[PDB]
Amino acid sequence: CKSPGSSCSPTSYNCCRSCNPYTKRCY
């Protein structure tokens, strides 16, 4: 995954804790 806080794409949700759609950053 991507680490929390990290610059990610909203729709792919490619974080361990989902990508915040508004900020492009993992919860």
Which structural technique was applied?
A: NMR
User: What's the number of domains the chain is made of?
Assistant: 1
Domain that holds residue 26: 1-27
Rounded to whole angstroms, the Cα distance separating 2 from 14 reads 6
SS3 content of the chain, % helix, strand, coil (to 5): 0, 25, 75
Structure tokens belonging to residue 11: 């729709």
Rounded to whole angstroms, the Cα distance separating 11 from 5 reads 16
Rounded to whole angstroms, the Cα distance separating 11 from 17 reads 13
Residues 6+ apart with CB under 8 A from 22: none
